[PDB]
Amino acid sequence: HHAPSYRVKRMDIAKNDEECVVNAANPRGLPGDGVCKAVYKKWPESFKNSATPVGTAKTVMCGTYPVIHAVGPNFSNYSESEGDRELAAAYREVAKEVTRLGVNSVAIPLLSTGVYSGGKDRLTQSLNHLFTAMDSTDADVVIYCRDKEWEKKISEAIQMRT
């Protein structure tokens, strides 16, 4: 049968072609910044009762279209140690949700790499926690970013594995 893949697109995640989206949410279900705010402009109804704790994910149905609210840690608040564990946990919940939904594909941004980055480049950290959780799912995963340099590195990381 199908053959689950990983791909990267460098474009706006709100314009994704996949069966469901993962929002880089804040714990309080707020419009927020960057990806989360792009998610809010496109799918504001998905923010109804979407607030959920750090390290978890909460799905809100927007019609038949699932929005997976995943709360990665803000490294300005979490130590590297605790944060690492929360970023892992957040991704783990994405995998369980994508599984529970029976979805064939999902679009995902790199959690905790922007406003939550604490000033640090976290491409490899976040990507790696993404693989570790998603590698056991069979959904087609499409990773979104905007930076040209970031796309290339994520592309290299995908191709190097297969």
Residue 29 annotated in ligand binding: no
Domain 1-162: CATH architecture, name and number where available: 3-Layer(aba) Sandwich (3.40)
List phi, psi (to 5°) of 8: -120, 135
Q: For residue 30, give both structure tokens.
A: 């707020």
24 and 36 Cβ atoms separated by less than 8 Å:
yes
Per the listing, tokens 């340099």 go with 149
Sequence ranges of the domains in the chain: 1-162
Say how far apart CA 144 and CA 137 lie, in whole Å.
Answer: 18
Method: X-ray
Beta strand 57-62 with 65-70: parallel, antiparallel or unpaired? antiparallel
Residue 94 annotated in ligand binding: no
Residue 116 annotated in ligand binding: yes
Residue 26 annotated in ligand binding: yes
Residue 31, number of CB atoms within 10 A of its CB: 12
Per the listing, tokens 């809010």 go with 40
Residue 128 annotated in ligand binding: no
45 and 34 Cβ atoms separated by less than 8 Å:
no
Where is the chain broken, named by the residue before each break, C–N > 2.5 Å?
A: none
